[model samples]
Target: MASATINLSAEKQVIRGFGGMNHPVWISDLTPQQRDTAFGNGEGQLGFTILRIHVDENRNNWSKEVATARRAIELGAIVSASPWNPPSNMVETFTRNGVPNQKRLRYDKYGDYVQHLNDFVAYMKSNGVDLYAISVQNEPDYAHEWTWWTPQEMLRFMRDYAGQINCRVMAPESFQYLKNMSDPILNDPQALANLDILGAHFYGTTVNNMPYPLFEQKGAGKELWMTAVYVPNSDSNSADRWPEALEVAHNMHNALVEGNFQAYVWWYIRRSYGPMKEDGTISKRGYMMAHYSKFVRPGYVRVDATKNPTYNVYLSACKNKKDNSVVAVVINKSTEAKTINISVPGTSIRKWERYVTTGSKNLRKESDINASGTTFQVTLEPQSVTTFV
Candidate 1:
């Protein structure tokens, strides 16, 4: 058994809650059972504390968005909204394809559009669900059959209207890699000043490709967040190319170790293809998140552990307040089953438990996971994720 002890009192930062899926049409058409299953019952299933709602300002579905958000709030989930595009009337083009129109909206309409978002926030508040954060735009770098905003325009809008909005403002939800595109935003003094959190999407970019060093050098006072990511198998060969759980665990580990990102959010909870199939089915990738979300819960911290060459295990330690129990997360990215020895410095070995999720199982409960002294051994199944407590 590989063993490690983590101190809960010495916690530093927190990973924000998981991101939810977006399909306005689907949400509108959700049957009662589907609604309860997707939103109501899902509140605690994956241990998600934060919910990101995609707001289609160009479409006339603000009311529906509000309703869904309110429902999520009722279930004790924190909600935030991100817009795909500005209202059709305000934008130069109505279609959400290609690049954004180079033309800038009039100052008043621009400000008014922002106010429209604020209205949604106010509505959420009235319903007892406070909006924790708001993104200026979704994937500002790519127009993609929706709304568009150039880098300069995005910066200006954040600088001008961010302060006016009550919630924390996230900007430039770029699909580009963090390292390559981070400079433009972080370099701009005005834009940097207005932004609350740095949000990036991992699409064309791999998690390991993020520039943590640059962020450390320039983003001393800022927070990093992976707002959107998913195993893209648009080619259909993804199923054979990557194991869903391993891919997710790999990205999660990279985000924490390399990017030092405090939060990791997936693109959609329900996808027909890729790791999470479109019909709300579970894939290996979904199980990867379940590894962390199910056991780590919220308020857990990554702790120190010896690196193993054979098994790439990303370790995190967290303490549970309700029980004062310590939890350790281990991700095994290996093809063969490997045993690990763990050591805890301050805490004594009292009881041990293990939970696992793999392609064979969503989350497996194997209690009384035996351990000895401050050290123990664990056999990590091939391409699996495990949590021990």
Candidate 2:
């Protein structure tokens, strides 16, 4: 019912990758076959390219956790870790400090807190897994069962202690991408200097709430990443399963287009509706992400493409500089299939292949079409997402 127009000359963000996080307790729970499938880069596997893990405060499970991350890394998965708490010993009493609502790292102990993070990364690296990034705290603004940090406290730690860490340090993991929690970090030169990535959890951020001009102008040194998101909280998230997982693609679309997030991350690695089913099988959600992740890997630059040229059709494209390959992801949310014209103005590439993911298909190889000088056509099924490469 809709005809979308796609132009490849327009460019967007430089993507990092699509990824997910897993609980450390479940690291030993996944069977070897399941682990292989979780990290597998081939068909039938949820080949997640980035692995985020919870950095346990006690460091009791470092070996088990590092092993799983190491396996995924060996398969080419980049790793990042987030701290749920800095360790109870590091928490300070803040009765009159105006930093209530949760336990927090002692203000004077910033050096020790960073040391804990550094040691955790060092432990992982010693076992052959170099952490790509680490967060100062997970959801620092809203930690129910974890440690919390005020915006000022976060700035203090980053400015004085983040440099002690072993890997790229990320901060202000805003629970809802709250501007209040992140603006100070972006606007402050000292805090911004220590931030390697401006990460956030988008549970509460809507498109209208996603303007980050401060980050856009001042974030030259960091990657903007969506570190966590989950199924739509609506009762009709009955949607992704019923409609063959449109929300996954929809979420990725908004994160990249609206939020300018370079990397898109789902909540869990092994959940009922995560990338992998409890049995380690890739779910439709997994395949939906692969629409972009499978081929649009790190170093891929999002190029300007025709957006909603017509109602119900969404489009995005990326170009991999290394291989000179261009890929486009299109999602059709209406009831009727629609064909669209795709073109790249400057590239001379001629051949293009399109992959399909409908209610019945899971990133199944679809059709390869000959492009007339960077132009091609493809129809998207109702409630489906397709990728052209």
Candidate 3:
């Protein structure tokens, strides 16, 4: 058995809401009921606050895209769109593989492409769906049968065209593991200056591999977001299941604690191979997101937390503005039941409550909690993650 403890201290920071999901081609295939079930009603079913929409420049319909955005907004989700390619006519090649032929579109077409995107933004805004952000290209570094942009060209486009867009713009949604290629955009003053946020994908890069310190150093004055990531690969094996969500939360906490990121976005919310299984099945990974999302609901600021070594715990504390109540989430990654102490700075520990999640048949609750002095020893089930308030 092992034990862990987390101490909280109040701090002031804007709390961005949690619960986000990626809506890709599968969105187009959804029935109205499914769409509503997935995003409508807004209260149940993971109430995603953000939706990342991939714009298909070739065959995608702008009106349909706007309609989808409207539905998401109706369901209370902020929308952001990214281009996989400029219009097929504007790109050097029809496919997104390798480097763009560059010769495909005349130099003047870059401005036109931006204009089209702006038009889409305007269309959405006029339809009562104000997009939260936009990405210049879905992974500019690697063309990959989608769209590609060299650093210099991308920078030029952002400086000239992207600047004209009314919405905030994200750049270089590069695939994870291409940090070498993606790092330059952050280091370059000219390119970095124009971007509203630095975005990255976690396809091949693990959370630990994300160069968080670089953001702290070079990205001092910039916004950072983890735009996308999936779990357990295509095979979907459970060998690393014990540490899957634990590792993600740990890495994300470390990065947020170290680099001070504004947002962290998961790749796909309901995919066959994602945090949730394809058949609407919930996995431990899904619960992992809830560990933070359920307690750390959006608009909750992350406060300071101290933890004991045995627990391998990660903590983020937030205060609900409406009620002035504080919510603290502590994640335990150990494989045995244990108890630990907690100490709060400049605050009373009276009436403290806790919530827990484990592999036990029934869901854990705040009433089942046990405490002691400033050092409250909470039981953590083996191979599970627990969140407390």
Candidate 4:
């Protein structure tokens, strides 16, 4: 029972893509069919356009990422890598917060670490997969399971060594999208200059804190990516759980509309608690992601839409000029179904196709609505997400 308008002229961020990570060491590499199910834009596919892989500490394990990465690239998905730790030799132990043993990159070994990152870029290139970006470290501030880096330490590495990397450089993958982890980089000119993407994870970050005014003020020409996160929880065999999986859609709406992020990457592409289930089927969470990923293809730019036309309702719109395609993802979080009127001003789009996912349905394709000139209206089902293209 609300109305919203999509302004074609009011453009926002150019979407990099939506995807998840693939770590052969942590769990397993995405299966061959899983890769197709993930990257393919066809029926029953996740339609992911970006792939995040691990930069394993041991060089011999590098080949583990190639098979899936190569297939993802061949399927037109861009690949990026994040290192959980530098090579073992370059790290030094330190006691922090009463912990007996903690690891960090040695200050003097900064040069060696940069070379390690460079070698990864070269190694991937030699294997016919070119990385779109490489991160300095994964969740440096929240690294109980991995390597740790102080904010100043990360700033030092970016200011001094990040420029030498061959591909686009991302740094300080902050857990929970903390600003302190990235604020120093934004404030330092030398460090900011070397940074290509300001990456953050969406673990427990509140909606209010997601927007980075500092990044907007200073981070021109640099991309902001939500590199990794899994919604709700990581309990075993929980990917199929409904309503809980809907939080993924809600978080994504905040990530796009509030955070203005270019890319959203989930933690694990195939896991019990991830978008896709372990058995190579699209879980309920996967459908939540598909609402945006499938319709909002890469190279599409987010355009201005009435974000909250009514209570518990959210919307984000994107357009592809190449084919005059406009996609709007609307989430209705209410228990009772609501009718909403939507209009795209001054568009040549003829008809609007609809797909919906509710508590019981998993991305069920619905009837199409012919564009009433530049406007259309639909009744969004309760507790559901709908993608209109």
Candidate 4, residues 1-389: lDDT per residue as tens digits?
Answer: 58999998888999999999999987878889999999999999999999999999999999999999999999999999999999999999999899968999999999999899999999999999999999999999988888999999999999999998899999789998888889999999999999999999998899999989999999999999999999888999998787788899999999999999999999999988888897899999999999999989888999999999999899999989787678999999889888888888798887888999998887788999787788788789889999998
RMSD of every prediction:
4.0, 2.6, 4.0, 1.1
- Global fold similarity of model 3 (TM-score): 0.81
lDDT of each: 0.63, 0.79, 0.60, 0.92
Residue 134's lDDT within candidate 2 is 94
Candidate 3 on 58-81: residue-level lDDT in tens? 545665665556776787767778
What residue runs in model 2 are displaced by over 4 Å at the alpha carbon?
1-9, 26-29, 93-101, 234-240
lDDT of 4: 0.92
* Per-residue accuracy of model 2 over 1-389 as CA lDDT, tens digit each: 33444455566789988888877574444566766777677867666788888888888877768667878888788888999887788886554445455588888778888889889988888899899999999998887668878888888888777878778988888988998888887787878888899999988778777668888889886899889987664332233384747877887887877777898888876777777776667777878887878878788898776666568788887888776678888888888978776666667778777788888777877778787665676777888888888
TM-score ranking from best candidate downward:
4, 2, 1, 3
How does model 2 score by TM-score? 0.93
The model with the greatest TM-score is 4
Better of 3 and 4 by TM-score: 4
**Ten residues in sequence with the least summed lDDT for candidate 3:** 1-10
Model 2 lDDT on a 0 to 1 scale: 0.79
